[PDB]
């Protein structure tokens, strides 16, 4: 039948999760942002559409830091992005508090990964 795309955790007959795919549409509709890995670091950059002359220049920052060594940038629904960084920050604080050392990027990535994957289970 149909209706497989109305509820979030449902598998369509071809094994897909339509809500996750519709989410992607929201991402593609967003501003473009990138990242470049260099020989000893990484660079992040993003496009900030100037809706009007009324936007105070340089003020509405989009890139966010996590702990003191991680940068995050995203495209799509900005509020969802912040929500994810907030979790990332708690995720990083928790890790440092227990292990003393600031959280490794691979570890941090999976923290974000498991959290997002979790939002496709219900």
């Amino acid at each position: 039948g149909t209706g497989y795309d109305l509820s979030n955790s449902v598998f369509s007959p071809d094994g897909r999760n339509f809500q996750v795919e519709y989410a992607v549409k929201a991402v593609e509709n967003g501003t473009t942002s990138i990242g470049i890995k260099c020989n000893d670091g990484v660079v992040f950059a993003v496009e900030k559409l100037i809706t009007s002359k009324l936007l105070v220049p340089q003020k509405n920052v989009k890139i966010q830091v996590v702990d003191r060594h991680i940068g995050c940038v995203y495209s799509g629904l900005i509020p969802d992005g912040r929500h994810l960084v907030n979790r990332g920050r708690e995720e990083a604080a928790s890790f440092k508090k227990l292990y003393k050392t600031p959280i490794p990027i691979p570890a941090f990535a999976d923290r974000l990964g498991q959290y997002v994957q979790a939002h496709t289970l219900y």
Partner: peptide
Amino acid sequence: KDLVTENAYDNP
């Protein structure tokens, strides 16, 4: 140390 980290967050 955390106060310092936290203060930096979203603070240009």
